[PDB]
Amino acid sequence: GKRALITGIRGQDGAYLAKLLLEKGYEVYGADRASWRLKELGIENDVKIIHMDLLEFSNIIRTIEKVQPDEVYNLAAQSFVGVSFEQPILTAEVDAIGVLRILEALRTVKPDTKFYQASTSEMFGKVQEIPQTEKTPFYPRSPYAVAKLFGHWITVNYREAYNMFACSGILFNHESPLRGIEFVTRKITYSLARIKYGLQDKLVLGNLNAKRDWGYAPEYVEAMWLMMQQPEPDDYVIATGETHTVREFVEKAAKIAGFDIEWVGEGINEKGIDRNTGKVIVEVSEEFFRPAEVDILVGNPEKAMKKLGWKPRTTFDELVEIMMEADLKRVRD
Amino acid sequence: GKRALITGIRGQDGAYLAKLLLEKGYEVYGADRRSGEFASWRLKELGIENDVKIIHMDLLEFSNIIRTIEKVQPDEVYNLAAQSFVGVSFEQPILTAEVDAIGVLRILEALRTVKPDTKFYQASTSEMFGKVQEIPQTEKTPFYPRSPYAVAKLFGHWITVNYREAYNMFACSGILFNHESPLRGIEFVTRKITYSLARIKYGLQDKLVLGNLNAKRDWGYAPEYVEAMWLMMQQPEPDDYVIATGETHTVREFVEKAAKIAGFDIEWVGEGINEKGIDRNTGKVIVEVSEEFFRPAEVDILVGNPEKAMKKLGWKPRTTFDELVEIMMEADLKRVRD
Amino acid sequence: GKRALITGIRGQDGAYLAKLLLEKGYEVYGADASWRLKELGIENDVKIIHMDLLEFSNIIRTIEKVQPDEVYNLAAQSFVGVSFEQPILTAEVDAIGVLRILEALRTVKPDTKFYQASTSEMFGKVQEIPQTEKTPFYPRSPYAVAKLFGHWITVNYREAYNMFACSGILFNHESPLRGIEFVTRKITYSLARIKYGLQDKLVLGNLNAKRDWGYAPEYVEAMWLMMQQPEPDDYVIATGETHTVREFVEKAAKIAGFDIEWVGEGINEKGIDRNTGKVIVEVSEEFFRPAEVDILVGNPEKAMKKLGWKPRTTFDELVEIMMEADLKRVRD
Amino acid sequence: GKRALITGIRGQDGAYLAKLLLEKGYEVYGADGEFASWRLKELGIENDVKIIHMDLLEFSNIIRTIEKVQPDEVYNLAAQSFVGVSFEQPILTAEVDAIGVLRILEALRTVKPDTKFYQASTSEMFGKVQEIPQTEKTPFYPRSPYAVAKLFGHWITVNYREAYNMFACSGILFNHESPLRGIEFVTRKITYSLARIKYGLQDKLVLGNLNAKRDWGYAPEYVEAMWLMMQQPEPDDYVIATGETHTVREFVEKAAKIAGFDIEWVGEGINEKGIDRNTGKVIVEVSEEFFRPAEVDILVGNPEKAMKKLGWKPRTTFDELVEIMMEADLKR
Numbered sequence A: 001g002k003r004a005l006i007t008g009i010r011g012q013d014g015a016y017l018a019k020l021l022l023e024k025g026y027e028v029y030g031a032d033r034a035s036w037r038l039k040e041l042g043i044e045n046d047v048k049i050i051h052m053d054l055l056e057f058s059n060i061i062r063t064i065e066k067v068q069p070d071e072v073y074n075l076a077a078q079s080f081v082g083v084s085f086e087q088p089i090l091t092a093e094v095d096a097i098g099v100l101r102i103l104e105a106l107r108t109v110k111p112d113t114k115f116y117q118a119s120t121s122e123m124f125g126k127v128q129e130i131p132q133t134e135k136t137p138f139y140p141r142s143p144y145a146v147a148k149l150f151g152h153w154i155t156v157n158y159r160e161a162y163n164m165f166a167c168s169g170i171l172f173n174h175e176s177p178l179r180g181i182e183f184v185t186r187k188i189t190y191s192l193a194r195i196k197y198g199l200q201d202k203l204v205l206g207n208l209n210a211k212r213d214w215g216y217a218p219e220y221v222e223a224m225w226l227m228m229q230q231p232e233p234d235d236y237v238i239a240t241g242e243t244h245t246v247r248e249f250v251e252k253a254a255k256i257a258g259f260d261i262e263w264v265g266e267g268i269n270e271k272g273i274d275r276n277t278g279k280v281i282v283e284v285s286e287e288f289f290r291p292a293e294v295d296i297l298v299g300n301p302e303k304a305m306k307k308l309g310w311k312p313r314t315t316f317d318e319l320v321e322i323m324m325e326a327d328l329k330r331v332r333d
Numbered sequence B: 001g002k003r004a005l006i007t008g009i010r011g012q013d014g015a016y017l018a019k020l021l022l023e024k025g026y027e028v029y030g031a032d033r034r035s036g037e038f039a040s041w042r043l044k045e046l047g048i049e050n051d052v053k054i055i056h057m058d059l060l061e062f063s064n065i066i067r068t069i070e071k072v073q074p075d076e077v078y079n080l081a082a083q084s085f086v087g088v089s090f091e092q093p094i095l096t097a098e099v100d101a102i103g104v105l106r107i108l109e110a111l112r113t114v115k116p117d118t119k120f121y122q123a124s125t126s127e128m129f130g131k132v133q134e135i136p137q138t139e140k141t142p143f144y145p146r147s148p149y150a151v152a153k154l155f156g157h158w159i160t161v162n163y164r165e166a167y168n169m170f171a172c173s174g175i176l177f178n179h180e181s182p183l184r185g186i187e188f189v190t191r192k193i194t195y196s197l198a199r200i201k202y203g204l205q206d207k208l209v210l211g212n213l214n215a216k217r218d219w220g221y222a223p224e225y226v227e228a229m230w231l232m233m234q235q236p237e238p239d240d241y242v243i244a245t246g247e248t249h250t251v252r253e254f255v256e257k258a259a260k261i262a263g264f265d266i267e268w269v270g271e272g273i274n275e276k277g278i279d280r281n282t283g284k285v286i287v288e289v290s291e292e293f294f295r296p297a298e299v300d301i302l303v304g305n306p307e308k309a310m311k312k313l314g315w316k317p318r319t320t321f322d323e324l325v326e327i328m329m330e331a332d333l334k335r336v337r338d
Numbered sequence C: 001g002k003r004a005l006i007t008g009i010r011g012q013d014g015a016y017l018a019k020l021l022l023e024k025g026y027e028v029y030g031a032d033a034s035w036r037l038k039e040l041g042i043e044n045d046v047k048i049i050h051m052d053l054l055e056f057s058n059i060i061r062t063i064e065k066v067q068p069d070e071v072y073n074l075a076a077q078s079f080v081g082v083s084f085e086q087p088i089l090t091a092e093v094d095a096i097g098v099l100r101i102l103e104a105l106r107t108v109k110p111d112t113k114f115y116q117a118s119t120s121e122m123f124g125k126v127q128e129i130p131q132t133e134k135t136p137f138y139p140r141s142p143y144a145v146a147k148l149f150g151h152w153i154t155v156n157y158r159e160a161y162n163m164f165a166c167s168g169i170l171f172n173h174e175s176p177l178r179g180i181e182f183v184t185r186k187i188t189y190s191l192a193r194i195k196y197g198l199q200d201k202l203v204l205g206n207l208n209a210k211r212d213w214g215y216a217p218e219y220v221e222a223m224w225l226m227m228q229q230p231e232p233d234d235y236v237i238a239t240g241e242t243h244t245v246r247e248f249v250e251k252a253a254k255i256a257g258f259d260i261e262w263v264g265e266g267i268n269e270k271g272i273d274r275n276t277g278k279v280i281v282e283v284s285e286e287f288f289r290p291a292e293v294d295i296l297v298g299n300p301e302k303a304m305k306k307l308g309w310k311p312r313t314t315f316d317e318l319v320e321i322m323m324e325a326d327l328k329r330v331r332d
Numbered sequence D: 001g002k003r004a005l006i007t008g009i010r011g012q013d014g015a016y017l018a019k020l021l022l023e024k025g026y027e028v029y030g031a032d033g034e035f036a037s038w039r040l041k042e043l044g045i046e047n048d049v050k051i052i053h054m055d056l057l058e059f060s061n062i063i064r065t066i067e068k069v070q071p072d073e074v075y076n077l078a079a080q081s082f083v084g085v086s087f088e089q090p091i092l093t094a095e096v097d098a099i100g101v102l103r104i105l106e107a108l109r110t111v112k113p114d115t116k117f118y119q120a121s122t123s124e125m126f127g128k129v130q131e132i133p134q135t136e137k138t139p140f141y142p143r144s145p146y147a148v149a150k151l152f153g154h155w156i157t158v159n160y161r162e163a164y165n166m167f168a169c170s171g172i173l174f175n176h177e178s179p180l181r182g183i184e185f186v187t188r189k190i191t192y193s194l195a196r197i198k199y200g201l202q203d204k205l206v207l208g209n210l211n212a213k214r215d216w217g218y219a220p221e222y223v224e225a226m227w228l229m230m231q232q233p234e235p236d237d238y239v240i241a242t243g244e245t246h247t248v249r250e251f252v253e254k255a256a257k258i259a260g261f262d263i264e265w266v267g268e269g270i271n272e273k274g275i276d277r278n279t280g281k282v283i284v285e286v287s288e289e290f291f292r293p294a295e296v297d298i299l300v301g302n303p304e305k306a307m308k309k310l311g312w313k314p315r316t317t318f319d320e321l322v323e324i325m326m327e328a329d330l331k332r
């Protein structure tokens, strides 16, 4: 029975990771500064919530002293790229300096602690190779990305300089029913469900050609745990290795939702018609439609599949189905 | 008339940059954390102490930085400050990040808000290459920091790039390799060597204790490097440049050439950590390697390829390694003769 | 409609201040759902925004974006006990946090009116009885020490940059919005339940503890009054009189149908309802602390003279407002 | 042998304390440049003091230091001690002179509680004096971010004594100069100036308020007081001053004499000018440029308690001091 400490406990990954660790018999302490996610997973009463703020050092030190964890998963952050352009300094304090604060607190009070840093594919920014691996040169394109890159390297440096068990997971996009409404995958499934129940009329999106490497969040936090259970600390890219367009997602979700969508038109004037009603379910707005991105983010996780035995167990279709089902259920109630 | 704001004004680079811009008709405002009665010594030694306006601006106080930009309204800002000590960064990692990484973003953000048309130069370092991924290293060599200082600087470099690409601000990042001068700080091997030999020749000192005499370094002449900073800032489009000599020399060579200039015919008797420098001239021991500094042969060779600087800025090393060693040794022999 | 910014919006004071400011035509921005805002019916009228007192830049942009005319710093890590365990964190919010706001205003909008929420805790080892603005401070906890910094840095920004910065030294104030962890709500809320079977007995601490208790709505009004004066100044906001935890339990119990008779002493004191001859109130070693030697009571006359402020609710009415309110809640 | 850890080792008081403690057989460890240790060199102890890197802002760094040094006595003499800079960098000043004190205390509490601790408090905390002279009992009234931050360091030190039972002292020292005094302060300015004005390396001397009555003492004697109170059976706070005041004007007069000058104070106000009644050449001007935001007029302390309990008292005379400083600079 080990003790794990999860920052960002209220988010998609913290929630699912909490679930996973509890099933493996851990005592789970969620760092926070009630959560609808822990509750939806039915574990809000088994997750021990304690205070901790990555913005200040002394409270982190004391939290480690009191909790004495075996494993610390830092999934906490200001993860919105957009916001980071407006609040770059605050973003840096949490996503960059905050990472160091924990490492320095573990170095100072409990050096035998395992540390996982939640890195992102956003660090590859203007991709230097396709697909991307642990050896692909980084090229951040937003304050958020630059702060994350800092967190990455500072985690590698503490591993090399103090021989601490510090891992860095360079994770690519991963969704789930607990995904924020702010995200395209959830927006699509949430919206479609509502439309099917008259609570909404049309699904308004951006470029339907945008491509992403989408995975199933539960399987991703599992890779986090896997990294942490190895004899030697290392960093891994975690992704599916394939990309899909926003159109494939809408299209497949609309299908599961019962619609018989049939695209027509192109560009900003694209539309999806439900051949079951004859009305337009989806349409593109200039408000969202942005320039087709030449840089393609898709990771090559063979290193993780190799050393960790990790591998996606959900196909893109299964993921789309899971999310659409969950949201068809949510809207009914 | 143009006006420049230089952080770390009282340091080696800041002092030379100030001297250079003053010669170009610039109005020079500066700021340095190190104050006191001997702090502006580099400014006194170059004779520009009364030609530089010193203001208070700490890289950790955002409101102070903002007020400074508002009041000074600079045309060019050169961020040359920093707690530039690799060693100390392990003992003060967060403070190091707050100054060398976030301090960069504080200046940029106050510039974007107060006077967005201000040119900005960030003093990045070859330390960001750390475990060199390519030999030599160019602007394209993947970075691999090996210390909180290197990692912070990496943030400082990228945040600078991002502001150039995202806000179309004129922001430059100069990746400079070691550059020495008589103004270099005693802490560095170069001043340590010359300042020590000078004290040895004049009997004020016993011996010179160093680390591995095989350590290779790409040493350049400071005055030429700050000139490269000004060059970058005068280009139509901002960019980043590797500024180095492109060739290395061993700490041993530096001691030898320097020893002579001081009146010593050094002969190297020993192996590695047992190596010793005996002046045939008097059969006495001048140099010995203490295990206190020694470090096994480094597999990583830090050597920069400044060909891009040559092509766009028309910049290249002019002073020679022998001229550099000589310039430094003479400056300290002179300092000791007082 | 003037624009106001309130840190600590979800707390008792923040909730009541926002209601007072809204009735007066203000645009209210609250820095941080909250059951209090919803209970006052102003949840949809308070514009919620983000602001963290532990970091400086986010505060700057918030001021540059809201351009508030009045700022009320009611946010804080206000737990003496917890402050002994987290002294540094406490200082960063209750001491440096105040300076971060003031420094933001000074840098971006100097004509902004600023109110700092100080506490009688700064009198700690009371140097006079009662305590006034002229009473020497003597903080007895990291919390009180931090708040003291908050008070003085506020005085210094007024005198150095000539800013309209006020500091109100407020004593205890209660209301139906007080948290259950506080003695007064615990009393009324408990009695209500006991009256409807939901609970068995009320377990308190030293029933001899004496306190200067006021009505929160009147205290946040003094805050606003301070901010409307010609000149900025500091004021002690209190009732000037005190009562024991016993008087409170008793008066409330009488509103809850009980008829308490006190038997026992110190840690062995117990209250009995004659009407039903049963032990309702009892003291336990868990909540028992010796009778504070530092008698905390404020003389609010300066507030009368310059603000024309004074308590307008009796201790009895305060107990009634709370007891009645929690009886209604328990029913529904 | 006794082991002491001093912060601000290269500062004025830090250097003298190092000298004195070495003289008493202590192992000295100091935390804090190519000429930075110029003070240690001047007192020729530069090689008897072990230097370690510890910054008042890096808590983890402070902990490792106590852990590595295991000091018996800790004297915190480091600080961003510039009332002026204080207004330009109020947050940084607080983090170092206020929270910085707390980080040490907290590091001592958890790594080595039995360590004696000394906080370098200051008379600047009395600001707009509430009594004349000022004693340990004179209510404080800070007039700058520096003063306010220090006030926190004082109270936080007191609280760690009273609450955690630690040996924590707070020395409320009044202004004290020496030849090592920083060139930023008025005293070292005047003497460093005249050794120039009257040497053709400068014209005149521009000063601000030539009326600020100041209690001036001799640095070496004041650091003696620190060691003394730290040696008492019980920790406590003490006021350390000469109990005698002299205006900046009065200081210049004598300070100039030791170089050849006969004041001719002509003109009251910003138009005040002091000419040499000898070579008939004006050598002293004025300018609002040197008038502080919230100035502290009179400052005179009553070191009566230090006398009774520590036996401490000022020896060097005001003139002896002016002489000491004026000569070391004439020489330089």
Ligand SMILES: NC(=O)C1=CN([C@@H]2O[C@H](COP(=O)(O)OP(=O)(O)OC[C@H]3O[C@@H](n4cnc5c(N)ncnc54)[C@H](OP(=O)(O)O)[C@@H]3O)[C@@H](O)[C@H]2O)C=CC1
Pocket: A007, A008, A009, A010, A011, A012, A013, A014, A031, A032, A033, A052, A053, A054, A055, A074, A075, A076, A077, A078, A079, A094, A118, A119, A120, A121, A171, A172, A173, A174, A175
């Ligand atoms: N989702 C993805 O597809 C990918 C995510 N990641 C990264 O993985 C991590 C977890 O992902 P996910 O759950 O979706 O992200 P979230 O955005 O949900 O995680 C943010 C969490 O951080 C907490 N938090 C914010 N500031 C602080 C602070 N100062 N101190 C402590 N906690 C704080 C938040 O709490 P509160 O609610 O109180 O603000 C919230 O629970 C993030 O760091 C993200 O950047 C990387 C690659 C892909």
Ligand SMILES: Nc1nc2c(ncn2[C@@H]2O[C@H](COP(=O)(O)OP(=O)(O)O)[C@@H](O)[C@H]2O)c(=O)[nH]1
Pocket: D082, D083, D124, D175, D184, D185, D186, D187, D189, D206, D207, D208, D209, D210, D212, D214, D248, D290, D291, D292, D295, D296
């Ligand atoms: N620094 C400084 N202080 C001056 C000057 N002229 C007058 N003063 C006053 O001298 C007094 C003492 O100044 P200083 O030695 O710097 O000490 P401090 O006031 O304790 O920081 C203050 O009240 C100043 O306002 C001047 O030119 N420089």
